[PDB]
Design a protein around this nucleic acid. Structure first.
Ligand SMILES: CN[C@@H]1[C@@H](O)[C@@H](O[C@@H]2[C@@H](O)[C@H](O[C@H]3O[C@H]([C@@H](C)O)[C@@H](O)[C@H](O)[C@H]3N)[C@@H](N)C[C@H]2N)OC[C@]1(C)O
Ligand SMILES: CN[C@@H]1[C@@H](O)[C@@H](O[C@@H]2[C@@H](O)[C@H](O[C@H]3O[C@H]([C@@H](C)O)[C@@H](O)[C@H](O)[C@H]3N)[C@@H](N)C[C@H]2N)OC[C@]1(C)O
Ligand SMILES: [NH3+]CCC[NH2+]CCCC[NH2+]CCC[NH3+]
Lengths: 52, 195, 203, 148, 97, 46
RNA sequence: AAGACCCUGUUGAGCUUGACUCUAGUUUGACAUUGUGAAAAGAC
RNA sequence: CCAUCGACCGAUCCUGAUGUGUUCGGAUGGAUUUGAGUAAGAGCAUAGCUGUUGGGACCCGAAAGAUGGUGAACUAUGCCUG
RNA sequence: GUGUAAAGUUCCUUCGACGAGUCGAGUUGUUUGGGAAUGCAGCUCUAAGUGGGUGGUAAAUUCCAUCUAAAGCUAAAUAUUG
RNA sequence: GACCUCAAAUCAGGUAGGACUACCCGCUGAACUUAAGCAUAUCAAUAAGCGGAGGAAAAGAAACCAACAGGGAUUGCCUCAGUAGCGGCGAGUGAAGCGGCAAAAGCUCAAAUUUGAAAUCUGGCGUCUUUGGCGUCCGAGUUGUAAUUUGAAGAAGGUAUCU
């Protein structure tokens, strides 16, 4: 039936928590390598590049 | 049918309910299209605002006395006090409500004030007005520029002034007077007429 | 003018003058066909009040309709079900005799639009009505700004859809707490109250 | 999700956990609240006493808005004072300059008397008040002012 | 006008009163010189209904309470019965003068 | 058989109730002697 | 050939009647359709 | 957290102060009574298994009941023409 | 521009027409959450002019509040197994 | 020679019917089913049957809601609320006012003496710059076609110069 439940509600604060946690994880080189990214030849994470 | 310790339920599903199921799969689509309609309607009449100016009214019902909200239109007396005819007010973005009456002073003053602010900010173009002045103005959001504001509750500091009778006793006596009003003024007559 | 006098006089249906007129006219109407054209309104003030004008393209028909209730048309009175549904007599049609008059006249003059109608007479067997009709195709109607609206196809057979004064009465189309069930249409309101509304993010 | 349900674990077992003798059938015992007075009386009298019968009087066309009167107790009353000036009000408040508390504008109908006030004069505005609530307010040097 | 407190008789908040010009729709029931004139002529042309004549005779025989019961049955309500009985006594009083 | 007639059926052929039927009976009941004032052999003058 | 006999089921159906509950029809009254005269008894 | 004796709020029974629209008010003190109450809040929201009720409701299965239609090429009976 | 024209605004005086076998009442049937009767319809009775309707417990008495029926048109937000 | 009523014509010119089904406006109207039986109830004011539309329909500018410090055409969503209430007060059933929002838009007749002028309108004919304009002739119409008013008002006499 179409009236099966398709979308799911998440508390907005918990969703923000997960977003913050994922942003923090992006600065951990071991996590980035485990995730599969080829970041072996980058000096430091976070990688910040100029506004040009 | 009835079993272990559970709340007794009222699930009304004994008609052919599945023939009448409305799933709002189109919630996002209708949001987007309603947004596009607002865009087209605003572009049609720019720089004239899309929203007519609305009055500020008290909400009825002892539960909602404290609040004040937007009404349907200004009364004939409110427009009279600002010097604007009802049939002319409709042509300059002011709503009119022939049904609402002004029994008191406060709402009347607030709406006369709103009307004066709107008239002070209004610019009516005519055939002499050039395209460069018409291009000078941006389509203003009227409900944002003239928001309905709740009057602030009293706060701050003031002197303490204790009446001899308590508030509780005042309320009890008021209830008692209301309750026995009818029979006491029947006694007052029948004792008087017998005099 | 005279229309005010006619208005007040037609409210004295039990005076000797009106009783005499009703008797004679009821006999005359009962002599003619069940549906016949009327050369003019028998109550011009009443017809005016309901939208009639003495113009080309305005037409008056008269019709008689049989009085009483609606016998249930089942063979030999058998209804084949529960006792609550066994009734045959003392049953009542949910539309009035006025609407039946309008609908039958509309069926006979199918090129016209039914504007409104009024009672004219009554005996024990029949009620008599006069039906006001407008010709959508007549230029005197199509060029008249006060009556152009009835040319639009959304008013096709408005008497069959309960859209005249009598129809809107029988449909219960009136404002307030006494008409909660029928205010916006009975079946529409029932459907709305019996619809499960599911959103994407179910609360 | 279906993969975590016991339906998956019952696959290959004849009765799907419903028993060989009893045999999950359509509606043994009736549908809904059937038999509440006959063969389900032993449930209703134990877990839902009061279920059957009439108590009290009817109220045609009850309007719940007539009865709106949210309650606030004295132990909570100072939350209504502005949070940035609460500390100052607790120190400087006197008989000639006391904080005003408009309970109705904060959405309350009656001030009840549970708890203890700060020993500081206040001016309390309310539609209704309990006898003890006013007595405790007057005892710290305050007053209740009736509003409508 | 209101007491200013939430209980008792005449309860509610005090507001500064403002006078309201009466709506023209509030005059609906008032008679006019046009209608009174026309109705008097129609009464002369029409005359009284059978229950109205039967109701005159009751009042002439000092049957007020008896005329009132008939007028309530004929018209339907006690309020309308009272007005019709008053109307018919003015019909008798004018007849003598 | 009983479906066919008020006289039908039974383990002998017989009417089973009085064959004199009320004038006020309804269709399906009026079989036999309808609203008979009398029955039996007529004897004597009339 | 998922016994047609028998029993069970809060499963039926055909038929009957002084079962329970109704019903077409029919009959009886009132009111309306429904007007115009006269007489004799009664009533205020 | 548990056993026990109290105290507080509402219902019920009694008592009945200063007072009075003299019939209202209800100070104060009692009572093997009563409540899904108080006595330094615990809830709201999302998700998961299990359990419940209404839904075709684990799957397949009646004898029945209803609404609207189609048949007298067989056969029953009358009529018309052979 | 046929503008001694059409319209609007303000003040003063006198007026101010406003829908009937309809409203309403009884009763019958049906329907409604509408309960001494929610709407609808049949039959009987049948109005008025500060009158009429409503004010969710029947009635009479006295007030109050609120609208203005028995004639009419009208985009949008709503529905959509074609 | 009019008039009224009523006819006829292959008279001049038009109009209606039938189709489609998802949604729409009405009429008519079940039973299976639930109540562990069953009749009121429920299923359901549903299916089937009938009439009538459009791109939406219907509703709609209060004979409304309220009881407040009052709101202010209609419609929909969220909430009210599985609540008030209805119900072999069983099984079951069940709205409205307020509040937030989407969208917002208002009006037309009848009842009035043009009475110093039926000022109104269909049709025919001619003509043109043809969804029509002009001219003319019958006809409709005083048992009332125009202008003027619609309760928020408004009218007839004045008014102030305004716009
Ligand atoms: C009026 N007489 C009282 C007598 O009634 C009793 O008081 C009870 C008391 O025991 C009850 O209290 C009882 O029940 C509550 C429960 C409801 O939560 C418990 O919390 C409490 O511990 C328990 N004692 C209290 N609820 C009412 C008083 N009248 O205590 C003795 C007494 C003083 O004689
Ligand atoms: C430390 N102060 C405590 C205070 O916390 C409170 O204690 C309650 C206690 O009275 C309750 O317990 C009470 O209520 C229960 C209930 C089941 O009716 C009764 O069975 C019990 O007899 C009774 N004492 C207990 N359930 C929670 C504590 N916080 O009340 C008692 C107290 C001594 O004042
Ligand atoms: N859809 C149901 C149609 C039958 N109607 C019966 C429901 C209402 C029954 N009356 C309730 C009691 C009277 N107030």
């Amino acid at each position: 039936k179409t009236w099966r439940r398709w979308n799911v509600k998440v508390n907005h604060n918990e969703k923000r928590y997960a977003t913050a946690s994922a942003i923090a994880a992006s600065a951990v080189t071991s996590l980035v390598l485990a995730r599969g990214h080829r970041v072996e030849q980058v000096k430091e994470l976070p990688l910040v590049v100029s506004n040009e | 049918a009835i079993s272990k310790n559970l709340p007794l339920l009222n699930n009304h599903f004994r008609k052919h309910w599945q023939e009448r199921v409305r799933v709002h799969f189109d919630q996002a689509g209708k949001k987007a299209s309603r947004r596009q309609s607002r865009l087209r309607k605003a572009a049609k009449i720019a720089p004239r605002p899309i929203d007519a100016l609305r009055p500020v009214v008290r909400a009825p019902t002892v539960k909602y006395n404290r609040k004040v909200r937007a009404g349907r239109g200004f009364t004939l007396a409110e427009l009279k006090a600002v010097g604007i005819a009802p049939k002319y007010a409709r042509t300059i973005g002011i709503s009119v409500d022939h049904r609402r009456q002004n029994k008191s002073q406060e709402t009347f003053d607030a709406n006369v004030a709103r009307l004066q602010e709107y008239k002070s900010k209004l610019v009516i173009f005519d055939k002499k007005t050039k395209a460069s002045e018409v291009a000078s103005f941006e389509q203003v959001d009227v409900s944002a520029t003239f928001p309905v504001e709740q009057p602030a509750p009293e706060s701050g500091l003031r002197a303490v002034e204790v009446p001899e009778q308590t508030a509780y006793r005042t309320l009890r006596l008021a209830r008692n007077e209301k309750k026995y009003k009818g029979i006491r003024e029947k006694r007052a007559k029948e004792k008087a007429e017998a005099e | 003018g005279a229309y005010k006098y006619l208005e007040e006089l037609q409210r004295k249906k039990q005076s000797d003058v009106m009783r005499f007129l009703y008797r004679v006219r009821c006999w005359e109407y009962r002599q003619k066909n069940v549906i016949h054209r009327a050369s003019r309104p028998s109550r011009p003030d009443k017809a005016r009040r309901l939208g009639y004008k003495a113009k080309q393209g305005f037409v008056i028909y008269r019709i008689r309709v049989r009085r009483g209730g609606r016998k249930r048309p089942v063979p030999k009175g058998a209804t084949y079900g529960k006792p609550t549904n066994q009734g045959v007599n003392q049953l009542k049609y949910q539309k009035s005799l006025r609407s039946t008059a309008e609908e039958r006249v509309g069926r006979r003059a199918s090129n016209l639009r039914v504007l409104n109608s009024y009672w004219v007479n009554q005996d024990s067997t029949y009620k008599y009505f006069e039906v006001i009709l407008v010709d959508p195709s007549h230029k005197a109607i199509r060029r008249d700004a006060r009556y152009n609206w009835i040319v639009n196809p959304v008013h096709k057979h408005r008497e069959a859809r309960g859209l005249t004064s009598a129809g809107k009465k029988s449909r219960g189309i009136n404002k307030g707490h006494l008409f909660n069930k029928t205010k916006a249409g009975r079946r529409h309101t029932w459907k709305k109250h019996n619809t499960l509304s599911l959103w994407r993010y179910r609360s | 999700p279906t993969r975590l349900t016991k339906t998956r674990k019952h696959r290959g077992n004849v009765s799907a956990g419903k028993g060989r003798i009893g045999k999950h059938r359509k509606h043994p015992g009736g549908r809904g609240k059937a038999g509440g007075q006959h063969h389900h009386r032993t449930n209703l009298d134990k877990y839902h006493p009061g279920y059957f019968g009439k108590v009290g009087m009817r109220y045609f066309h009850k309007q719940q808005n007539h009865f709106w009167r949210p309650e606030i107790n004295l132990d909570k009353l100072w939350t209504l004072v502005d949070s940035e000036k609460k500390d100052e009000y607790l120190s400087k408040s006197s008989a000639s300059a006391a904080p005003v508390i408009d309970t109705l504008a904060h959405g309350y109908g009656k001030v009840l008397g549970k708890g203890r006030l700060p020993e500081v004069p206040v001016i309390v505005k309310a539609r209704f008040v309990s006898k003890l609530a006013e007595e405790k307010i007057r005892a710290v040097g305050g007053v209740v002012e009736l509003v409508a | 006008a209101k007491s200013g407190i939430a209980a008792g008789v005449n309860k509610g908040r005090k507001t500064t009163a403002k006078e309201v010009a009466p709506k023209i729709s509030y005059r609906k029931g008032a008679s006019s010189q046009r209608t009174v004139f026309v109705r008097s002529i129609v009464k002369e042309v029409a005359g009284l209904a059978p229950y109205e004549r039967r109701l005159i005779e009751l009042i002439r025989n000092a049957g007020e309470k008896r005329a009132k019961k008939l007028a309530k049955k004929r018209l339907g309500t006690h309020k309308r019965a009272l007005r019709k009985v008053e109307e018919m006594t003015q019909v008798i009083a004018e007849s003598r003068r | 058989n009983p479906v066919d007639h008020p006289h039908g059926g039974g383990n002998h052929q017989h009417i089973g109730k009085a064959s004199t039927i009320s004038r006020g009976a309804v269709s399906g009941q009026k079989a036999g002697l309808i609203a008979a004032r009398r029955t039996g052999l007529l004897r004597g003058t009339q």
